[PDB]
Subunit: 493 residues, 4 copies
């Protein structure tokens, strides 16, 4: 784990449009904070409807027929993306520090996991650019028919604060690989890494207007994107609540395409025959990773009666081993929550757990004199009606439940409007296949949890999302199919 | 062209749920009319929110893990669909008569085109049932990862009145092939063919609750479908205006998946080098087919200056050759519009053409003492600002425009919020490919128009739709991808 | 199990070319026998090089550009195949009787398994006809590039005697679905079902010359096919020995494409944790099905030491329960071997088992006064060097071996030039996945054996074959890819 | 066009096995020559059957289950290939010089075309590594079935002398991307670039034994590869004559898979309406590129009568503009033929053209006092029976023929056992599509010629080849499909 041997200096704080740095039309700025100290890190230009309009015009112009981005070889789009990955690799130390400092993310994770995933995902996407293909089709009658899988056009992309850099790349990688242009609105909490990446997009040689980055707030800049009459598609990751507003606004405006990656209340099912230590470790990591600030948090763990007490005991032992503090210090194993609103919501939910009669096993309160820290918390004897069993906590709070009937626990696992992911722990082949088939979740892990790679599509069932990101399948939502049918004198097979 | 040698008797008029016939919960009925005579044909049970709720419960139960529809071989779903096609083929005379009588559709077309397309499309879809496949994926790390392309679940399907039988099959064929269950709401104007098909679904042996058909009105039964908290996906074909309401309601309710096939204002571009007679014939058929009541109507025809006068002349000659009347009588070549609302809208638009200074070449008024008939109408010297150049008419009204610059005419062709289809007429290879690439339309025909087959995906760019129907690509919107990732000791390529 | 209530009458005995029945050019005929009685059933026209030449000219003419088979809609090729399946279904009783009588196949199996598989496979293939698609490709430079997946042309298809009807359809179904024309040479032992099917091909309405059937001998008619200068592809199922001659002759003649489905010496690995009764039953059925006359016979069963004695005991109990006799009589559970040569080879191999010191558990000799019957035979304590452990027996002879080390048994399983299939019996998820990955076999069954369906590709590793049949992947070997690259002024994504 | 500013020094001349440099088992060496001067460049170790055996053992060991190459992430195989491309890019000057000096290839072409194509193709292949996917399949019955697209194993790859570096990468790129190990035998005329690349394979960090390079002769080392009992697949590019021997030897040995890219006698058809200057230029470049030493040489140009004289005139003008000499000197536009055998064959064929009565328009003899130079030669009034119209010349010799009937000229174009490529020159959409459909050739160019890219599959019909290289489709011949079918209690869609 190497480190940045010089203090981090912030440089890019302006709106990025047509590969140039712009002040906001209003001239207004907004503060960016460090969640571990509660102090301001810098001021960033506040983009609003006027700044989004400017970005969309730039993206539209870069998408015009005959433009450099439209006419360059698909393989050259791929080359630009591979170059961008090499540049992010070059700036790995500074990006990981910036991510840790701005996002409250453990530095070891930011460096070893987030930045590695960013680079790997970009390289994966670069490889697809010249492999996106349409079809020739044996239509009835004397015609030659083919399809083009064209880019859609201008894509508005709203990035969350939990994995700012990784999610930036999950959105721009496929969009750019397919030949779209983008208007990106990073989270108001975490715009800094995106703006540094914008500097590298310019350096890599992307044509101007292909990527535009407008920092600002959700209700202003985000709503402007979702309601814009000349944005062809919006991609959003965040709360199911905002996802509903995005989908509504797309309908009311211009029927723009929508992909959504939203909340979860993901279940694990631990059968009596499971490797118990493996299940305890993965379920733990599943819920506590990045201070519980993952959509796929394993937030309902159902364990068969006969191993339930042992599971809870081993779980509690594991949860008591954390060292809270500044995420930049080596040996620290839990950072802060992102901000006050999230912090408040987590404490309010923990209070309902206590009140509604869940058994508190450890934690259950705040920590420290500054920073938005929550003690890692475990609740056992949780029942399905409790707030902590129904609502996404997005904090370091583990719920452990008991079951005796597999039919019943699958019904309980599925009894939610969420459906992002699930885990199944068992040594039985038949159970692994049949339970994973029966769970209403977009990703099911068997004897593991939280394994996400560029090669696999990822997305939710039900209210956890619309569409998929990554893998071969995820590229589909960044193309628009055009059928061309040509009259011919005589067709032959 | 054989005919039904006995008078048509109407039999199926009730709500179809769990393969049984139900009265409406309210007990209310609504009238169904013949648009050629303005007389009532029968009374049909009026489904509302209570009847939709009943249908969705039935569809949900038929979709449960372990149910007959979920556990039967994919190849058996295909067999049921091929059986259903054979039954529709058996009842071809009666279905085509019912379609002609109820829908105002020329009988020769209903028999030779609509019913043939219904049967062919069903047979095509039947063939896909056991060919829908997921992937095994070479994920990073020691894991085995695969995907399942599962059915989504309960699909609400809202069918238009213009092609009631064909569009019923375009929706149910793929949905059922993929293993979904469906709640169908046929158009209030045209429920009769759908209910007859329901009788054949029962006869073919589909399990109960797999297909449920609830006749009724858009604002009541349609809104109930779009806003239902346990419908996983809604598919709608109709006006862009209603499409916007559907997408809004999906967002506000349960974030259900939405596919929309909506209006158009589709352009044709006729180059000076085109086979003129071929272009005149296809552009004519393109706009006048089924009394102009096609989403893909070729409603803006741009013709190069030097051949423009000849094109208009030959167009007018062709448009003056129709015989209006009852669509059941042999030799009749134009039937009525579907209803009063459509009729009014068409006459009001024709009035704006005259008023705003378009040149009326033929037609321009109503016809007859009964039935919703409009004279076939041609306007030349149309300009881009006129109501008839901007708004979907959905009537027998042809607009012919002049151009001299190809750059300019592509911009004019694309200058609309619509984007369903387009036509290009030229003998030049380079022009055919480059113009078709530049047009923002889901289907582009070259030297033809209106060629639609089961093998080709069909759908709109921009506000003409979201998603695609038919072809390999159209099956994607009736599946939900689940990724399963299994921990293993050691992976090998 | 219904039966033919009238004595079977043989009708079609001539060469089938251009949908007409031909005598042999020489005028010669050859006898066809019943293997259960050793008596002649009829005389069939003996096709030779002159008759193959005539068939290839017919197939070539039916494949010419502009011919009915080349110009008909892909969907119509599919319709013809679905019609042919309906006709085979209609003649199911007579075909199953003919198969049983001619092939020595148990009637219950012929009716319930072979004929059902024939019909299902044809219906599967029919579904692919209009779903075979090429690609549009984003090539570097200003070009439009697409591919056509064309039929190859005239395909010579050499069918084995073990599953004459099923294998006829495995070859012609995909070939015809893809738009090829075929010259078929059924096994000299079993030409009768193929000729009846030819009568149904004519009845279904296939254009003449699309399917031609030339009965005759391997060294004459088969060699003529393999060495023909105007056959584009040869498909052969049979012994690895003949497969080598076919591949050699394709190289020496016209470099025709070759697919081969050849012998096996397929292993099963039974782990100590396996469901023992399930493993015993599947391994038994795996080796004894159709008198052991299956390429995939489970002819080396490796069982973990601790359950080995119990496995052998339960295996022997199962093998002693057969009733030998005429395959048409209800209750009979083992028919004869196909002919003298196979019969001799089986007895000679059984003699080596005894001689080389394998432990004979049951059987080990001939049965009856007529017909080519072999007692069902089990050998335990078999070692890897014995003839019965190395050579394909193609008879009712089970070999059971012991192992203690999983590493070692995988090496033993793989230590063969064969590689058609394998079985793994275990309750452990990790073992199932890792063992199946490590086995060098085209199909690996887990906790089952011999499960073959139209939807799955099937074929060998190593000397068990070249290429795959059936599934999506199997259709590839019946197309030829043509790339078309068109110069254009300017490409756009 | 930058150049190597230091004299080229040859370094790598030994056999490359397990990432180490080996002398030949015999200790023998063979000379390598410069074809422009006829002088020896160096001595290289002569690999024979003993050296191939050593290479195959190394490749087999690197392919064992549990080895680094088998267990590394697919994405890491891709990374190694992208690294190798970066290294070839770094050594571009030296590789292009070595190619020019050893291969007789014009330096500008070697640098700007060959090396660029090498790098681009490697980068394309790198992108596929983690995108090779199998399927999950909805089989009949209660089973879970999936497929693995595994690497085949040890691939023997025999590279031609005409494009030594490009063809090396066309073979190793896909093979390695798919996870195979390789034993490569470069052409005896041109081993030097391959051995330098081997040095870069070691530097990039490929595991030992994954790539092994054995220089030597065709009849010894090549035959050893083709006949080896433990090589799973052989890929060969070269003469159709040797291709036949390779396919024969694969059949006689171990039924190894064979892909062949062989000769051509490719036709162009120039219609009267074609852009004549464009057609003349592409047809010229098509036949004369790299001294005519391309499999796809446009060696039969059929031109419509009315433009034939003008075409010949303009062709002859173009062919008279070459400057022959050493391919390293700027401004030189034609290098030597590769060796004496090729040189002799070309002069002998040119002599038949004169003798059999073709009209000699220019050239027709040798050039210079040293080097294997042939004057660029044009023959008009060529007829279909002449040796120069039937046999692959593989030299700078253009044949121009006359036609009047399009039906007849397509028959003439197709009347050959070859089928690699073809060109069609016309402005007519219908003709372009229908002629390209009717030509029996693997690649058809329209209004261009010789356009080859990594994204497009390439290969022959008929005796010009078996299989395809490059594009998505070309990756298929470097995988082996394994079906895994798992018994389950109950399947659900
Ligand atoms: Cl498509
Ligand atoms: Cl997928
Ligand atoms: Cl392809
Ligand atoms: Cl597959
Ligand atoms: Yb505080
Ligand atoms: Yb009226
Ligand atoms: Yb005997
Ligand atoms: Yb000389």
């Amino acid at each position: 784990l190497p480190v940045l041997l010089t203090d981090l200096k912030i440089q890019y704080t302006k709106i990025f449009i047509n590969n140039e740095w712009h002040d906001s039309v209003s001239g207004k700025k907004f503060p960016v904070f460090n969640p571990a100290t509660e102090e301001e890190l810098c001021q960033v230009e506040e983009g609003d409807k006027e700044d989004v309009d400017k970005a969309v015009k730039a993206a539209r112009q870069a998408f015009q027929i005959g433009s450099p981005w439209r006419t360059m070889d698909a393989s050259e789009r791929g080359r630009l993306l591979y170059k961008l990955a090499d540049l992010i690799e070059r700036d790995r130390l500074l990006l990981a520090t910036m991510e840790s400092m701005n996002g409250g993310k453990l530095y070891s994770n930011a460096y070893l996991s987030d930045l590695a995933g960013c680079i790997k995902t970009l390289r994966y996407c670069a490889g697809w650019a010249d492999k996106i293909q349409g079809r020739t089709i044996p239509i009835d009658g004397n015609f030659f028919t083919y399809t083009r899988h064209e880019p859609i056009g201008v894509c508005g992309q709203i990035i969350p604060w939990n994995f700012p850099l990784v999610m930036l790349i999950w959105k721009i990688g496929p969009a750019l690989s397919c030949g779209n242009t983008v208007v990106v609105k990073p989270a108001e909490q975490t715009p800094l890494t995106a703006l540094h990446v914008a500097s590298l997009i310019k350096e890599a040689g992307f044509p101007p207007g292909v990527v535009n980055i407008v920092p600002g707030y959700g209700p202003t800049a985000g709503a402007a994107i979702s309601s814009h009459m000349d944005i062809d598609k919006v991609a959003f990751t965040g709360s199911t609540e905002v996802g509903k507003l995005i989908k509504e606004a797309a309908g009311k405006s211009n029927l723009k395409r929508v992909t959504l990656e939203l909340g979860g209340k993901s279940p694990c099912i631990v059968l009596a025959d499971a490797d118990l230590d493996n299940a305890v470790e993965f379920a733990h990591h599943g819920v506590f990773y990045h201070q519980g600030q993952c959509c796929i948090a394993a937030s309902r763990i159902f364990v068969e009666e006969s191993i339930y007490d042992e599971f809870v005991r081993r779980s509690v032992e594991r949860a008591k081993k954390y060292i809270l503090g500044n995420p930049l210090t080596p040996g620290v194993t839990q950072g802060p929550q992102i901000d006050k609103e999230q912090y408040d919501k987590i404490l309010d939910l923990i209070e309902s757990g206590k009140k509604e009669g869940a058994k508190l096993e450890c934690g259950g309160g705040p920590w420290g004199n500054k920073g938005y820290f929550v003690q890692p918390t475990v609740f056992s004897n949780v029942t399905d009606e409790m707030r902590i069993a129904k609502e996404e906590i997005f904090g370091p709070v583990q719920q452990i439940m008991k079951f005796k009937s597999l039919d019943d626990v699958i019904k309980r696992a599925n009894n939610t409007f969420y459906g992002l992911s699930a885990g199944v722990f068992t040594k039985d082949i038949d159970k692994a296949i049949t339970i994973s088939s029966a769970l209403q979740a977009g990703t099911v892990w068997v004897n593991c949890y939280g394994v996400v790679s560029a090669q696999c599509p990822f997305g939710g069932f039900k209210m956890s999302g619309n569409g998929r990101e990554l893998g071969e399948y995820g590229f589909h939502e960044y193309t628009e199919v055009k059928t061309v049918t040509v009259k011919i004198s005589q067709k032959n097979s």
